[PDB]
Design a protein around this ligand. Structure first.
Ligand code: CO
Ligand code: CO
Ligand code: CO
Ligand code: CO
Ligand code: CO
Ligand code: CO
Ligand code: CO
Ligand code: CO
Ligand code: CO
Ligand code: CO
Ligand code: CO
Ligand code: CO
Lengths: 271, 271, 271, 271, 271, 271
C-alpha cells in the first residue's frame, strides 16, 4: 500500500484565480503531473479536500478534468467549500464507490492490510464540520465487522481542537462522536484531515490524528491571533506506506527545489 | 508549553560550507533570527540534531555562537555527526542539565504538563543509533517513578525502521528496547527524532513517533533506492504546544515566501 | 490621515495579460489583498492611475471588480490610458464625488488637516497631459476658499520636465499653469503624480512634487536614451501620513521578500 | 550634475556576514560593480551611511577596498555605526576634503549649479544624531556666504521626527537647529539622509527632506510598533541630477529583475 | 545576415496552458518582446517549430497574433505537432513564400551570402519525420542551381539518430535521404532542427547539424532511459551571423538573469 | 565514450568571491556534486578552462580540492587566467599525462573511438592565445601518425575570429596555423574551446568548432559593442558522447529548475 494523499485543491473555474492572483488551477495541474511522474508509484490518490473553492459547477468541471488526468484510482471526499450535490454529479464517476446518495457519501476500502474509511464531514450552510448519526453508525458497523484489522479514517474536518485560533472554531463541531469511537475501537489507529491547510498532528489513545497542508496555499497556526491569514508557503502532501506492521506517513514536497545530489564522505568532511 | 523543535543543523567551520556549496551557517543564523523574532514566543528550543557536521572543534565554536544567540533556554542532544566529548565541552554551558559526563548525556524536564526526556542515541564510530544499557534503565526509571504525567522523548535516531532505504539501516539498532518501554508504559506518548531530515511519522501503541526535517538540507524518502540523496527542498521545524490534555505538533516553515494576506469572503467568490 | 497611494494599475480585460505576458490583473489583485491586509490601516486608497491599459469597457469591468474589493474608500483619477466616459461609467460608483460630468472629473476632500485635491490631467487623443482652464479656475477657487490650510494635489501627469528622455515629451504639456498656481498659493505644498512609473521627486518653492512607481511594471529614467523601455523591477506604493504638522510619505514595498527579523545588538556585533 | 547616492552599506569583516546571514559585503560589491557599469555615468558617488556595522578596523579594511573599487570620486559621511577616528583613518584617503580632524569631518562642494554640503551627524556612544556647536555654525557660514546658489545637505540622521516608531527616538536630537537654518535661508532646498533604511520624504518650507533605502537590508516604517524590525525588501539608491533650475532625484533599483523590453503600441492593445 | 532562430513554441489556445500549468502563451509573448527589443537587430526570425501544440485552429489564432507582433520578416516551418492545412491558413500570410500548397510547403532565400533552405519534415498521423521525394528533388535542384554558394537547411526533425533514448525513435525516419544529399553537395554546410527541445549538435562531412532548445519547456537527453521527460530548464535560441566566410551560431539566453556588469582588472584580482 | 566537458571555472582563494560577489567556489562545488551525482556517468571530465582567476597558489589550493573531489578521471588544460608553473604544481597530480614540463603541457588520449587531443593555448603576459612552434608540430604528428581514427582537440582559446567584439581580439592569434591542419587532415573533426564563456559554434571544412559556456558567469556575444560585459545567465556544460560513427555534443544545464514531469498525450491535448 502506497498512498499519495493531497487535499484542499480549491479549484476555481476555467481561467479564474483564487482571490484573483493565486493560480490554483495551474498549481494543481502541476501537482498532478508531479504525482503521476513519481518513480515509486502509489496505488491510489486520496483527496481529503475542499476540492473546489466556491462549489460552483464550472469549478467542478476544472476539477474533473485535472483530477481526471491523474493516472491512479482516486478516493475523493467533500469539504466545507464543496457542494454535496455537484460533487457527486461531477466527481462520483472518478470515485464510483461514493454512491448515488449525495447526502451519504462514504465508503470502505478493504484492499490493503489497513482498511481505509472515507467519510463526509462537511455540513451545508456552515464552515464547521458535522458528523451525522448515520455516518457514525456506519462507522461503528465498519469497525465491528473489521475486527482486529487496523483502520484509518479520512475526513475533511479535524475531530478535535488543535489550539489554532483561526481554525478551531470551524473544526468538526461534534468531533467528540469520533473521539468516542476511537475509545471504543482499538483497531482505529489513524485519522487524516484537510481543512487546516497545515501539517498539524496529535495522538488520542491508539490514534494518530493529523491535518494535511494544502496543494496550493497554506494557513499558519496562530494560537491567539484570529486574523484569517493564508500564505504561499511551500506545499507538500503525505505519502502513506504500509511498512510491515507500521503505517508510515512521510511528507513529500510539491515545491520545485535544487537537487538532489549524492552524499560523499570526502566532500562532507575535507582535510 | 510551547517548544520550537529544530534538528540536524550540521554546522561547519567559520570559513566553510557544507559540501562546498550549502551555506549551513548562514541558513542556521537565519533560522535563529527567525525564531527569536516569532510573535508567539516559545518557552524553549530543542535541537535533536547532528549539531555539527564533522565533530570538529571549530564547528562547535560556530554552533556555540549561533545557537548561543537564541533568546531562549535550549535543550541540546547529539547525533552521529557529533563528538560526545566536544559536544559537552562547547554546548554544556548552553544546556547545563546534560551533566558533566560526556558518555551519559541525558536529562528530564518537569516544568510542563508533559514530562520531557532528552537522551543521546549516538554511538562512537558508526552512523547507527544505540541506547546504552543505562540510558534504557534511566528511561524506565523516569516512566516508572513518573505516574500519570505523560512523557515525550527526544532522541536523534528513530527507534524503529520506517521503510526508508537510506535511513533504516542507520536507525537506532536496539530501538526495539525502547518500543518495549512503550508497550509497558501507557504514559509514554511522544517520541521525536532527527537523523532522517524528513517529516515521517508513525504510531506504535499510544506513542506518536515522528522524525523532523533538517534546518537546512533534507533527505528524501525512497523505499527501493539506496543512493545517498540529499536536496534543498524547504526547511521547516516543529512547534510543540500543550493544548489542554493534548500535545499538538505543527509544522512551521522556515522558508521565505509570499504572504500572508487576509481571507475575504467576497474576494474568495466574486459575483 | 493615512493614505495608501498606488497608480498605473493598467488593468487588462478578463483573461488577458499586459503585452501578452505581464499578468497585471493578478499582480493588482495581489496588491489589493496586500493593501487590505495592512496592520496600520489607511483611511483611504488613492489611484492616480492609468487605471486600465487600453480604455476598453471589458478592462473597466476588471478594474471595477478588483478595485471594488479594496476595503477602503477610494479616490480615483483618469490617465492618458483611460477613457473619460467609461471611467465615469464604471468607476464613478466607487468614487461618487467625481461627478456626473466625464469632462470635468475632479473633487476636494476636506476631512484631514491637509485638504486633498483630485484632478484630471488626461487629454483625449494624446499621451501628453493637459490642464484645462476650468480645471485651473476650480483649483484657484479651492485654494482661495481653503486659506492657510495646506493642500495637496493628485494628478496623472507631472507638471514639469524631470529630465526623463522617454517621459518628458509626454509630461503635462501646459504644466506651467500649475507651477504658477504654486507660486500664487503658499498653502499648496504637495503634488503627486503617476505616468512616469517611477519614484522621481523634486521641489518648486513650497511644493514637493513626485511621481509614483507603478503597481506592476516600471519604466527606468534615462536622460538621453529615448527607447521606450519598461521593466519588472520591484513595485511599491506611497503611504501618506499626517505627522503633526508634517505631511510624510514613505515607500511601501509591494514585492514579496524575506523577513522581517528583529535587530539584536549581540547578533549585530558578536565577540 | 549626476550623483549616485547610496547609504547604509554596513560592511562587516572579511569572513563575516551581517547578523550571520545577510552577505552585505557581497551585496555591496555587487552594488559597486553595478554602479560603475552604468551607461549614463554619475559625476560622483555619495555614501551617507553607516559605512561599517560595528566600527571595527577590519570592517573599514573591507569598506576601503570595495568602496575603493568604485570608478568615481566619492563623498563619504559617517553614521552612528561608524567610528570617527577609524572612518578618518581608512576612508579619508578616498575623500580628502573631510579634513584631518576626526571630530569635525565636513565639507562643501562648489563644482555644480547646486552647492553640496557634507556633514557628520553621528555622536559617540548613542544612536541619536547631534549637530555639534560648530557644525551648525559652519552650515550657517556656507549659506550666509553662499548667496543665491542653491544648497543641498547630506547628513546621516534625519533632522526631524518622521512618525517612525523605531527611527524617531534615534533621529538627530537637536535637528530643530537645522530646521531654523532652512526657515532663515531660502537658499537651502534639499536635505538628504541615511539612518532610516527607507525612502521617506517630507518638505519643510523650501526644503525637500528625504531619507534613503539602504544598499542591503531595509527597515519598515511602523507608526505604532516599536519592535526593531529589518527585512530584505528590494534595495535601491537615489540618483540626483541637475535639470535646468531643478534638482531631481529618482530611485534607481539595485535588485536584479526581468527586463527591459520596448513598448510597442500594437502589442499593448491588440485587435 | 543576422538571424534569430527559435523553435517549438507549442502555442496553446487563448487562455489555456501547456499541460495545464506551463504558460507557453505568456512565455512566447515574452520571447517576442525580448526579440524585438534586441540592440543588434536580426534581419529575420526563423521558427523551426512545433508552432502550436495540438494543431487546433484556436491555437493558430494565438500563434498568428503573437508571432505577428514580431517586428521582423518571419520564416516559419511546420512540425509533428502542427497541422499542415491550418498552418498554411493562418501563418502563410506571415511567411508568404511557403506557397499555396499545404502539402509542399518550402522555400529558398537568396538574400544572404549563404542561401537558406526551408523544408517541411513533418508527416501526417505520426511523430516521426519524413522527407518526401518531391522535397528531396526540390532540394537537389536548389543545390545544383546554387553551385558553390554555401547553403543551410532548416527542418523540424533531425536527419540522424543523436543517441537520445526518447527522441531518436521519433527522429526523421528517412533522414538518410538528406545525409546522402550532404555527401552529394559540398556547398550544403548547415542543417538546423527543432523537435529535440535541446541544443544537441554533430558533424557529417562538411555539415554542422544541430537541434535547438525550445522557447519554453525543454527535454533532457537520456541515453538509455525512455521515460518521456520534459522540464522547465532555461530557454534560449540561436543567433546566426555571417562573419566574413564563417557561419557562426551563438546561444542567446531567453531567461531573465542578473547583469551584465563590466569586467574590471582591479576588481578581478585585488591586492 | 561519455565526456562531461566544463570550462572556465575561475576559482578564487578560500575566503574570496569573484569580483567580490560571485561565489565561484560554491557554484563549482555545486557543479562538482552535480556531476558526480549524474545517473548516466561520464567516463571522464574535461576542464578546458581558466581553472583559476588570478593565477594564485591559494586559488590552485581551492581548485585542487574541489576538482579533486570529482569521482572521475580528469583532463585539465590551462587558460590565460592560469599560471603555467602553478597549474602543473597543483593540478598535474590530478592529470599525470600533462607531463612535468610546464611549458609543453599537452597530451593525447587513445582509449575511445575518437582520439582526444589536449593542448595549452595560453601564453604568459597576454590574454591572447598562441600555439607554440612545437605544440603545432606535436598536433601534426598526432594527425599524421593517427590514420583514419577521428580526432578532437581541446584548447582554451578559439582558433579563429567568431565576430565577438570582446572575445575576438583575444582569440588564438596564430590560430590560422591550426586551421591549416584541418585543411590538410580530414581526420580532425572537432575543436572545442573555453575562453568565450558562451556556446558559439561554426564549421571549417570537416571540423565542428565550438566554444563553451562557463560553469559560473557568462559573457554575451556583441558584434558592435566592445564594453567588457559579463553576466550570470544560466551555466551549463557540454556532454560529448560517441554514438556509432557520430560524435554528438549536447548541452547539459547546470541551473536548478522545475521538473522533470512525464509527457502524457491526454494532458497535452485535453477534450
Ligand atoms: Co475547509
Ligand atoms: Co480548505
Ligand atoms: Co544523523
Ligand atoms: Co543529519
Ligand atoms: Co500615463
Ligand atoms: Co502608465
Ligand atoms: Co544609522
Ligand atoms: Co543603518
Ligand atoms: Co516535434
Ligand atoms: Co516540440
Ligand atoms: Co580565457
Ligand atoms: Co574565462
Amino acid at each position: 500500500m502506497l498512498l499519495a494523499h493531497i487535499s484542499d485543491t480549491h479549484f476555481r473555474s476555467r481561467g479564474e484565480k483564487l482571490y484573483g492572483f493565486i493560480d490554483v488551477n495551474a498549481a494543481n495541474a502541476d501537482v498532478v503531473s508531479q504525482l503521476n511522474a513519481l518513480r515509486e508509484r502509489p496505488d491510489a490518490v486520496v483527496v481529503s479536500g475542499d476540492i473546489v473553492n466556491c462549489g460552483r459547477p464550472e469549478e467542478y468541471q476544472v476539477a474533473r478534468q485535472i483530477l481526471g488526468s491523474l493516472n491512479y484510482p482516486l478516493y475523493l471526499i467533500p469539504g466545507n467549500h464543496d457542494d454535496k450535490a455537484l460533487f457527486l454529479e461531477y466527481l462520483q464517476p472518478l470515485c464510483p464507490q461514493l454512491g448515488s446518495d449525495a447526502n451519504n457519501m462514504r465508503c470502505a476500502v478493504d484492499d490493503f492490510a489497513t482498511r481505509l474509511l472515507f467519510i463526509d464531514s462537511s455540513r451545508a450552510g456552515t464552515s464547521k464540520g458535522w458528523l451525522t448519526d448515520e455516518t457514525i453508525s456506519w462507522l461503528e458497523a465498519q469497525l465491528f465487522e473489521g475486527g482486529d484489522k487496523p483502520a484509518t479514517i479520512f475526513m475533511h474536518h479535524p475531530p478535535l481542537p488543535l489550539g489554532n485560533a483561526q481554525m478551531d472554531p470551524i473544526a468538526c463541531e461534534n468531533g467528540h462522536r469520533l473521539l468516542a469511537l476511537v475509545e471504543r475501537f482499538p483497531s482505529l489507529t489513524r485519522i487524516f484531515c484537510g481543512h487546516n491547510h497545515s501539517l498539524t498532528m496529535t495522538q488520542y489513545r491508539q490514534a494518530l490524528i493529523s491535518t494535511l497542508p494544502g496543494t496550493v496555499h497554506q494557513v499558519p497556526y496562530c494560537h491567539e491571533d484570529t486574523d484569517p491569514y493564508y500564505d504561499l508557503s511551500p506545499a507538500s502532501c503525505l505519502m502513506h506506506r504500509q511498512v510491515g506492521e507500521q503505517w508510515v506517513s512521510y511528507q513529500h514536497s510539491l515545491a520545485h527545489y535544487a537537487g538532489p545530489w549524492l552524499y560523499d564522505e570526502n566532500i562532507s568532511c575535507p582535510t
